[PDB]
């Protein structure tokens, strides 16, 4: 077979509006919104009667996307947005930015919180884990040189 | 456009798994390639995660187009203490990564042959896509799609 591409990583959130704003602070652009109320969706997910509203975010380079999703029906029945770092399953998406200090300062001003501290790996890069919108874990890195 | 910054790219999405060997094998079947694999025990890693004294084995998978990556992590210490690998679809938090493949039927057939399970049906969306959700390695939710025309 052939793997054409990794289209996107989806994240289920409580507020699409708040999620969109947070990711726009990171640098992604809102690419579109859609009220998915079809019945085919339910057939894919195995939920059946399903209505979800999504907002697709895309990075400036056009290669990566984040699909923000809010369930209307059926309502959500669990939450792992603030699971610990040492937990099995999806952990975080990592973004490389030009200036990690300015990004940490701006995000934190808007409510985000560092999980560890900003760390330098040799002379190659700097990175950190931060909890952003709705406590969701996100990684940030800066390439040195 | 950000006055004092620039988003260069989304480097990767990472998944914490029980078996690095099995997870690597699974994503290889999906079509990603293994760039590297290593044990990381330097204290710097623990400062990032906030766990402190940690030892984790990491594996970096990259897509053929070279634009996307999946980082697989396995904790030696401290042990894991929570699991959302099999969280329901209608749950808050990271849900699934979606891959577009050449032939979804062959991929579904092959993956399920190796123990993966189709969540619902392989559905056709109008005249543009055919897609499904699959519980892959360790029940981890993945999305698959094939473009039509
Ligand atoms: N922008 C509206 C769009 C609502 C809507 O239903 N749009 C159509 C056209 S993009 C849609 O999403 N159809 C189903 C699909 O393409 O997934 C919103 O805020 O949800
Ligand atoms: Mg600097
Ligand atoms: Na759980």
Give the strand content of chain A. Answer: 35-45%
Helix content of chain A: 10-25%
Largest sheet of chain A: 5 strands, mixed
Could you give the distance between the termini of chain A? 38 Å
What is the tally of helical segments of chain A?
3
Number of strands of chain A: 9
Rg over CA atoms of chain A: 17 Å
Oligomer: homodimer
Q: Give the CATH architecture of chain A.
A: Roll
CATH homologous superfamily of chain A - what is it?
2,3-Dihydroxybiphenyl 1,2-Dioxygenase, domain 1
**Structural domain count of chain A:** 1
Task: Examine the coordinates and then state which fold CATH places here, giving the name of the CATH topology of chain A.
Answer: 2,3-Dihydroxybiphenyl 1,2-Dioxygenase, domain 1
Largest chain interface and its two residue counts? A-B, 75 and 78 residues
| H and E string of chain A | EHEHEEEHEEEE
GO molecular function, one term (chain A): metal ion binding
GO biological process, one term (chain A): L-methylmalonyl-CoA metabolic process
Protein name (chain A): Glyoxalase family protein
Domain VOC (chain A): 5-143
Would you mind describing this structure in some detail?
2 copies of one chain form a homodimer. Chain A has about 140 residues and is of the alpha+beta class. Chain A has one domain: Roll (2,3-Dihydroxybiphenyl 1,2-Dioxygenase, domain 1). Helices cover about 20% and strands about 45% of the residues of chain A. Chain A has 3 helices and 9 strands. Chain A has helices at about 15-25, 40-45, 100-110, and strands at about 5-10, 30-35, 50-60, 65-75, 85-95, 115, 120, 125-130, 135-145. In chain A, strands 5, 6, 7, 8 and 9 form a 5-stranded mixed β-sheet that branches. In chain A, strands 1-4-3-2 form a 4-stranded mixed β-sheet. In chain A, a hairpin with a 6-residue loop joins β3 and β4. The longest helix of chain A is centred in the N-terminal third of the chain and has 11 residues, at about 15-25. The radius of gyration of chain A is 17 Å and the shape is globular. In chain A, about 40% of the residues are buried. The interface between A and B is large, with 75 and 78 residues. Bound molecules: glutathione (GSH), magnesium ion and sodium ion (NA). The site of sodium ion has 2 residues of chain B, from loops. Chain A: This is Glyoxalase family protein. Chain A: Keywords: Metal-binding. Chain A: Pfam families: Glyoxalase_4. Chain A: InterPro entries: Glyas_Bleomycin-R_OHBP_Dase (IPR029068), MMCE/EMCE_epimerase (IPR051785), VOC_core (IPR037523). Chain A: One of its GO terms (molecular function) is metal ion binding. The PDB classes it as structural genomics, unknown function.
């Amino acid at each position: 077979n052939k793997l054409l591409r990794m289209d996107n990583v989806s994240i289920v959130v409580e507020s699409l509006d708040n999620a969109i704003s947070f990711f726009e602070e990171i640098g992604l652009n809102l690419e579109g919104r859609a009220n998915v109320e079809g019945e085919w969706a339910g057939r894919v997910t195995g939920l059946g009667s399903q209505c979800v509203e999504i907002a697709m975010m895309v990075t400036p380079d056009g290669h990566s996307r984040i699909e923000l999703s809010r369930f209307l029906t059926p309502p959500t029945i669990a939450d792992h947005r603030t699971a610990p770092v040492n937990a099995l399953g999806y952990l975080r998406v990592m973004f490389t930015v030009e200036d990690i200090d300015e990004m940490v300062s701006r995000l934190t001003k808007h409510g985000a919180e560092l999980v560890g501290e900003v760390v330098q790996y040799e002379n190659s890069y700097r990175l950190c884990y931060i909890r952003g919108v709705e406590g969701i874990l996100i990684g940030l890195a800066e390439e040195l040189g």
